[PDB]
């Protein structure tokens, strides 16, 4: 029986820029024992990273149910912090980290 092993082994994947795998690395906590907010303190940060803010808020309000104690004194406010920003990014973009652009097909050829 384990929990932190599968989750921590994807904390890097969440930071590699391939977030689709990183969602799929924190979902097993919400199914192994959802009685812990940490399962909603990393998925709740990778769903937003693809653009699924709509699903991230549906996880923030399901992790704040498990921060009733000092074992999660910061997660108690990190799911709120992201909820407090998902309602302004589910249809807008002012915190991008992987956006891209090209030339106007008329640049100075240099």
Swiss-Prot record:
Record-level GO cellular component terms: cytoplasm; nucleus; R2TP complex
Residues modified as N-acetylserine: 1
Taxonomic lineage: Eukaryota, Fungi, Dikarya, Ascomycota, Saccharomycotina
Organism: Saccharomyces cerevisiae (strain ATCC 204508 / S288c) (Baker's yeast)
GO biological process: box C/D snoRNP assembly; protein folding; protein stabilization
Protein name as it appears in the record: TPR repeat-containing protein associated with Hsp90
TPR repeats: 3-36, 38-70
Gene: TAH1
Protein's cellular compartments: Cytoplasm; Nucleus
Pfam families: TPR_19 (PF14559)
InterPro entries: RPAP3 (IPR051966), TPR-like_helical_dom_sf (IPR011990), TPR_rpt (IPR019734)
Keywords, in A-Z order: Acetylation, Cytoplasm, Nucleus, Repeat, TPR repeat
Entry GO MF terms: protein-folding chaperone binding
């Amino acid at each position: 029986s384990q929990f932190e092993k599968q989750k921590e082994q994807g904390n890097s994947l969440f930071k590699q820029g391939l977030y689709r795998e990183a969602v799929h690395c924190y979902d097993q906590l919400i199914t192994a024992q959802p009685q812990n907010p940490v399962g909603y303190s990393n998925k709740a940060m990778a769903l937003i990273k693809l653009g699924e803010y709509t699903q991230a808020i549906q996880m923030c309000q399901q992790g704040l149910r498990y921060t009733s104690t000092a074992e999660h004194v910061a997660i108690r406010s990190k799911l709120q912090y992201r909820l407090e920003l998902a309602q302004g990014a589910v249809g807008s973009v002012q915190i991008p980290v992987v956006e891209v652009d090209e030339l106007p097909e008329g640049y100075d050829r240099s």
